[PDB]
Design a protein around this nucleic acid. Structure first.
Lengths: 913, 363, 358
DNA sequence: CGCGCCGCAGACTGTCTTC
DNA sequence: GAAGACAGTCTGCGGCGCGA
């Protein structure tokens, strides 16, 4: 207490030995090239009693908790592991609902698979929406099939009501279900789309694929291509490509599994699937059998590779993600798509406007003097009651001398003669049912649109052709760099690269729109607006396919709880609903989960049409997304990993002191407080520090630095070289990664090349591909990244187990993690949000205490022991006080900020009042 | 900044010489010229086409200039409310229903007790409560798109959401004039408060058939202005620095430009071209194209200035008839948006203009 | 007597509660007009402007405020035209024989308490050189007479008379022989320089204009026609056992009507939507008579279409889906035939051109 | 990580059509 | 016979998402 922070450690009463040599080593390391002497403003000491610890110590306590949580599902998995099964039935039924077969394929109309183990693969008709299209399941006894009911005429009911496939009884034990990516089958369940917690937990055999015998995507590309850069090429024979056929091939040497030739489900129609019904069901049953066999080969292997019950308990969690939504989701989808279309046509109109203005140039021959837009063909083709004196009959007297060349010839390339060639090509051909005036065939992808509305500094070798691509775009034949321009363009041999030497192509050049020396022409009014329009619509153009059609199920009135009903904001015609993310746990080689739409950055920044996706992820009425962003989770984990390995103290290395002594406000925080001061720019040096730590190398850091701003190769190398000074100074042995240090990469590398034990906190193996015993990876970035990634995953598992234990022993409602990118939201109902905030704080304290205990040291600083602010909001946003762009503002919606909280424990009793 | 000299030369504005921004926006201006009346008529026709005839269950309605219940009318909503009963009666009791109107409304303006006229377009939509929000969103959406088209720079047009004093949500549309953002339209969703205020005697007769059961209708009033919309279009069309090419042009949209085509005669001096130009004039009016009789004026000795003035009035095309039209007919054609010289036969020119206008209207 | 009731029933006129008697309709006290009446009035105003304003080369329109700015509801538009003539003389480059015309609402008193009623009238003030100034008015006496035959079924109904007064030496008055009785629908007055002196206190330099390279004071000929009253008289003249108003196609509020019957519902709806879209894009007014679930009788629907100033009636049946032929009936001819869906637009364009082309 | 459809963009092109 | 049109034809460079 008050030593260097810390607190009255309720856990582990007694002992607390400092260590004279240890503390002296820590002090002398922190003093040298660091700041050990700081004001160290104390925090108000927290006087509270923790929940009773069942075990002797923290590790035993959490082991018992996770055992209690995972025992029924573990015994169910083992029960299905060694159960004796008959072969597939000869033919399948045609009635609705579920059917069982079994003795001699005797069909029976079963209403529920009343057993605690299934594989239950599913296939859907992609053309006919996201509804299920039949399913094959293998319960341990006698096989199982399900009918989607969409094969019968009529019954075209949308909104996804009773469309998914029932899998749970009314409970008037618990269940486990397996699958390759059983997250994809967590939808199509109709009981997992429930606001109340689900007693069933799911196992993806792809999650185990990446847990045991997995490949990095950088290695997956090599695997599929081969199916310094030269590898030992042994690891390909022990890992598969995360595909059911490929993993079946790897885990058992049987007859190969065959993909559907026609792919009626992916590319096909409902009737064609009816035609090939029996064959498609046979292939689905083959897939289910392959899944069962690989699961049987995997589960004992997984348990011997990940034996700590907490990791498996937390992996059962995080397959129960649940994003509540309402009609505002559909409103936002429609509004964003409509704004996308409106801005697209506005930008098209702006493009035609500048095309017209450019064509106006040649009236005074002003296009030749134009420093831009001069490289086009730009050429002109030489082709009392008295009636009237002669009435309109003179019109009939004019006619023509037959120079019209019939009607076909004038229309496609000859229409509008005398115009510039670019205008004529851009104009729609007169021989068209739908003619539109002006250069309406002018898009962003053409060579004319960049010339106007994307002028910037008029890139001197950006004449396209040959390499084409971006050229100089900066300063330092003739006209290599000249404001007047009028370049000769004889050949791309100007002073400079004069081509795309780097050739970077990964959704880039959008961040350069904001300043970055990339701008339109200030002379025009609709020029810069078009560039702004492109900037705003880019992200939605990227992600509208994913964000739309997310398999959103709208819960009816009955399925909603009584917490929503008899509420001030109850009833109302707004369709309440939910989105299970279909998050594939352990999507990466690390056990980090993957979801391309929901588990992403999604800053919800302004000037972006598609933004505010995470925003308006609205807890139902009476519910709040009580959640916390773990204060620098990866940085703290690396810091403590370095702290215990060296002198057993939190302030041993400058990384540890910087992590918790620094503060965002007027402090020397690592991100945007110290990285900017020692580096360059802001909010990008944070990404640089997140990348160099957590897995990367110096070349990756340098490349990201060029991506951030414009710098020369020599200057970038010099900046990196200066950066290694005072940094870890990696790849220096015989030191006991040596050098200036201040950042312990020694722990990650040391535990990386440590055979089968691989994780400190929960003892979890990595994979059979990158492990050291068989092979030695040429670049070790993957394993050092994995150490921190899987430590963060074990952190999340610890929070999930602790929160489940606190929600069980203490009657805390909601109980639904929305874990995204190191942040956790739990949706913990009203009149428990402060109780849930205290539970979150106690869970963070216990998780960090377990990290410390299992990783070497006993004490825990108070600067990290508690969340800075447990955000208690009604929508998922990076801050409690935030706004969006496409609407007027969130206040126009029902969002009304919230309470960040922190040190505001007015409900001190964690137990109910 | 001060582009009103263009309106002084070409009668797109009232008779008064001194037209401050307050004078125009207040709605107490003396009047408009022929060009302004044509432009406002085009605006009204475009609105009627975009709202009423294209979308089913929408019918135009009329309101008297006075409300006996003798004072000049302030809003068009009351007239729609009075005719709501018959307009719902003629249809087959379909609760989703629309009413439309465009008319001149006089309002009191206090400046340092005057009465100013303004042309208001009113859309009254009766909807079930469940569909009220989505229909309101559709209404403000496609109204915003209508404002964006016929606008060179539709960023200056915008919308805002707001809450009424009685707790009812609504939206207000604005145009960003150079001096400041000014209101153009407002949207108010009401739970038939005014409808019951006018007819509180019986509530059963006011119900509409949304299906098997009947529910009380919910009203939505979208009220916009057009004279200020006219000034907004004129300001937007005019465009300043770093171009190195300054030409006074008013890029009014082809759909609502006051004059579409201009006729002229060359130097000659062969004469007789007036009869050809008159025949072409008649051929243009008989199809619905407004023509500027530009061939009466003479002794100019400069075609560039004539084209400049025609641009200032936003004349989409200029047609010049020379001595080479009687034989090997090729009239000279110049386009407003692009100062391009073309030679076209007399035939198919009227159909070309009709196709141009129709295609601009389509997109 | 039944004409007003028929017009009100078919949306041709507004409610008769406030204007049951024809006096209210004749004056400005009428209780508005129905959407069909509004469309007919707009079409008549557009045609009059095209024949007088767009057709004329030296004639350009003008706008006058509904209320009098003063120095009170407006009573005439001549004051605004006279005021704007000072600028128009320089703007029109000495348009000595030019004029300004406008069709708009003006207020007139009706009389316990005397009310103010708004009626639509078309006022044209033309400046003419004195040497033939009255002759110029005589020219209008021909042109306006042409309007009498522009759409009237019986041109003999219109009549003209000459009147004189101290203010105007020569004036022309036009009257329409309505079924109730003859009513004055157009008036002409040729004022001299007295109006210019009253408006301009000694502004001879501005009042004098360039005509034939000569400085001449322009005489102002004011011709005022009753747009609402003229439209009512024309509609009455159109009417003549079967109560059908053979209105002019140019001024008809609706040219063609779309119906659904004897065919698939989806196909009929698609055909009706396509026809409506084509009519809207081509500038042809189409009555939205579809989406009707009543289906009372074919005769009742035909009578309703004819009473609504419909030039022709179009019925879509299984023949349209089979060979593209739908029933087309002409009210004037009282005959029905089969016409192609694609050729409907061409037939409508030809009919409109024939009606417009005298 | 990255890779093969995929999808327009830009240039080519052998052959049909007109004077 | 000489020149313009045209509906295909090949290449390229963004990009996406995969694989039950």
């Amino acid at each position: 207490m008050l030593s260097r922070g810390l607190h009255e450690q309720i856990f582990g009463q007694g002992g607390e030995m400092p260590g004279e040599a240890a503390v002296r080593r820590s002090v002398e390391h922190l003093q040298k090239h660091g700041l050990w002497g700081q004001p160290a403003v104390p925090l108000p000491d927290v006087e509270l009693r923790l929940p009773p610890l069942y075990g002797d110590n923290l590790d035993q306590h959490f082991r018992l908790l996770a055992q209690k949580q995972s025992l029924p599902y573990l015994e169910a998995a083992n029960l299905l592991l060694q159960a004796q099964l008959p072969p597939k039935p000869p033919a399948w039924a045609w009635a609705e609902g579920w059917t069982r077969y079994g003795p001699e394929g005797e069909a029976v109309p079963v209403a529920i698979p009343e057993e605690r183990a299934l594989v239950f693969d599913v296939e859907v008709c992609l053309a006919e929406g996201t509804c299920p299209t039949l399913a094959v399941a293998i319960s341990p006894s006698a096989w199982y099939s399900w009918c989607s009911q969409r094969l019968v005429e009529e019954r075209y009911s949308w909104t996804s009501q009773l469309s998914p496939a029932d899998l749970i009884p009314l409970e008037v034990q618990e269940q486990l279900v397996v699958g390759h990516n059983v997250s994809f089958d967590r939808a199509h369940i109709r009981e997992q789309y429930l606001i109340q917690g689900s007693r069933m937990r799911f196992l993806d055999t792809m999650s185990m694929h990446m847990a045991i015998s997995g490949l990095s995507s950088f290695q997956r590309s090599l695997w599929i291509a081969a199916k310094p850069a030269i590898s030992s090429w042994d690891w390909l024979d022990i890992s598969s490509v995360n595909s059911l056929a490929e993993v079946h091939r790897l885990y058992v040497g049987g007859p190969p599994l065959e993909k559907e030739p026609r792919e009626l489900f992916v590319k096909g129609t409902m009737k064609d699937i009816r035609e090939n019904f029996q064959d498609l069901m046979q292939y689905c049953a083959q897939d289910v059998w392959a899944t069962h066999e690989v699961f049987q080969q995997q589960l004992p292997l997984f348990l011997e590779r990940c034996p700590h019950p907490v990791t498996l308990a937390g992996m059962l969690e995080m397959g129960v993600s649940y994003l509540p939504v309402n009609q505002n989701w559909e409103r936002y989808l429609a509004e964003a798509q409509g704004t996308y279309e409106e801005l697209q046509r506005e930008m098209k109109k702006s493009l035609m406007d500048l095309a017209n203005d450019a064509c106006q140039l040649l009236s005074g021959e002003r296009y030749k003097e134009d420093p831009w837009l001069w490289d086009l063909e730009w050429d002109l083709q030489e082709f009392s009651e008295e009636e009237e004196f002669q009435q309109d009959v003179m019109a009939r007297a004019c006619l023509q001398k037959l120079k019209g060349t019939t009607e076909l010839l004038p229309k496609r390339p000859q229409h509008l003669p005398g115009h510039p060639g670019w205008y004529r090509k851009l104009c729609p051909r007169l021989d068209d049912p739908a003619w539109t005036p002006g250069p309406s065939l002018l898009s962003l992808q053409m060579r004319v649109t960049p010339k106007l509305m994307a002028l910037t500094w008029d890139g001197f070798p950006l004449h396209y052709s040959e390499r084409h691509g971006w050229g100089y775009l900066v300063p330092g034949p003739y006209n290599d760099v000249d404001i007047p321009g009028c370049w000769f363009f004889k050949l791309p041999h100007k002073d400079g690269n004069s081509c795309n030497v780097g050739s970077p192509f990964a959704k880039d050049f959008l961040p350069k729109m904001e300043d970055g020396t990339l701008q339109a022409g200030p002379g025009g009014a609709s020029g810069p607006r078009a560039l702004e329009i492109n900037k705003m619509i880019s992200f939605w153009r990227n992600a509208h396919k994913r964000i739309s059609s997310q398999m959103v199920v709208w819960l009816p009135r009955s399925a909603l709880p009584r917490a929503v009903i008899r509420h001030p904001d109850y009833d109302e015609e707004g369709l309440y609903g939910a989105i299970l993310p279909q998050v594939v746990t352990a999507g990466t080689i690390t056990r980090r989960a993957v979801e391309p739409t929901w588990l992403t950055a999604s800053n919800a920044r302004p000037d972006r049409v598609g933004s505010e996706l995470k925003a308006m992820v609205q807890a139902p009425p009476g519910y709040t997304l009580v959640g916390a962003d773990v204060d620098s989770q990866e940085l703290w984990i690396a810091a403590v990993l370095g702290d215990a390995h060296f002198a057993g103290m939190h302030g041993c290395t400058a990384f540890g002191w910087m992590t918790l002594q620094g503060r965002k406000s007027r402090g020397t925080d690592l991100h945007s407080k110290t990285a900017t001061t020692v580096g360059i720019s802001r909010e990008h040096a944070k990404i640089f520090n997140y990348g160099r730590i957590y897995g990367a190398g110096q070349p990756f850091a340098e490349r990201l630095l060029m991506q951030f701003n414009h710098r020369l190769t020599q200057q970038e190398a010099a900046e990196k070289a200066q950066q290694m000074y005072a940094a870890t100074k990696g790849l220096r042995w015989y030191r006991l990664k040596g050098g200036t240090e201040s950042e312990m990469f020694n722990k990650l590398e040391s535990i990386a090349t440590s055979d089968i034990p691989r994780t400190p906190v929960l003892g979890c193996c990595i994979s059979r591909a990158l492990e050291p015993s068989a092979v030695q990876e040429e670049f070790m970035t993957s394993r050092v990244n994995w150490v921190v990634q899987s430590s963060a995953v074990d952190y999340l598992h610890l929070m999930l187990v602790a929160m489940k234990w606190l929600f069980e022993e203490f009657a805390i409602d909601g109980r639904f993690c929305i874990s995204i990118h190191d942040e956790v939201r739990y949706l913990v109902r009203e009149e428990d949000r402060y109780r849930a905030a205290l539970a979150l704080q106690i869970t963070n304290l216990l998780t960090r205490c377990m990290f410390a205990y299992k990783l070497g040291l006993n004490d825990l600083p108070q600067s990290v022991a508690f969340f800075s602010a447990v955000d208690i909001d009604r929508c998922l946003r990076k801050e409690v006080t935030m706004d969006c762009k496409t609407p007027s503002n969130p206040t126009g919606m029902e969002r009304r900020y919230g309470i960040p909280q922190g040190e505001a424990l007015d409900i001190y009793q964690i137990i109910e009042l | 900044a001060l582009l009103e000299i263009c309106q002084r030369r070409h009668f797109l504005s009232g008779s008064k010489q001194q037209l401050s921004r307050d004078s125009l926006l207040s709605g107490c201006h003396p009047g408009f010229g022929p060009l302004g009346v044509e432009l406002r008529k085009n605006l009204a026709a475009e609105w009627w086409t975009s709202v009423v005839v294209f979308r089913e269950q929408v019918f135009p309605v009329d309101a008297l200039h006075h409300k006996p219940g003798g004072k000049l009318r302030e809003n068009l909503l009351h007239g729609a409310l009075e005719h709501y009963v018959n307009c719902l009666d003629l249809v087959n009791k379909r609760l989703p229903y629309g009413l439309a109107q465009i008319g001149v409304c006089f309002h009191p303006v206090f400046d340092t007790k005057s009465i100013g006229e303004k042309t208001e377009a009113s859309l009254v939509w009766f909807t079930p409560p469940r569909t009220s929000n989505q229909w309101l969103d559709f209404w403000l959406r496609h109204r915003l798109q209508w404002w964006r088209k016929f606008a060179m720079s539709p960023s200056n047009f915008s919308s805002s959401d707001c809450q009424d004093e009685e707790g009812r949500k609504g939206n207000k549309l604005y145009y960003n004039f150079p001096w400041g953002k000014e209101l153009i339209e407002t949207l108010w969703n009401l739970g038939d408060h005014e409808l019951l205020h006018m007819y509180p005697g019986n509530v059963s007769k006011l119900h509409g058939r949304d299906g098997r059961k009947n529910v009380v209708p919910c009203v939505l009033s979208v009220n916009g202005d057009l004279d200020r919309g006219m000034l907004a279009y004129l300001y937007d069309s005019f465009q300043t620095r770093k171009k190195n090419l300054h030409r006074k042009v008013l890029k009014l949209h082809p759909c609502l430009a006051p004059i579409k085509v201009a006729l002229d005669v060359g130097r000659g001096p062969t004469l007789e071209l007036r009869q050809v130009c008159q025949g072409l004039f008649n051929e243009l009016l008989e199809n619905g194209i407004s023509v500027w009789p530009g061939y009466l004026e003479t002794m100019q000795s400069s075609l560039e200035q004539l084209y400049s003035k025609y641009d200032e009035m936003s004349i989409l095309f200029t047609v010049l008839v020379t001595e080479t039209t009687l034989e090997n007919g090729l009239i000279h054609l110049r386009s407003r948006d692009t100062t391009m010289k073309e030679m076209m036969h007399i035939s198919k020119l009227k159909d070309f203009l009709i196709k141009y206008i129709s295609s601009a209207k389509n997109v």
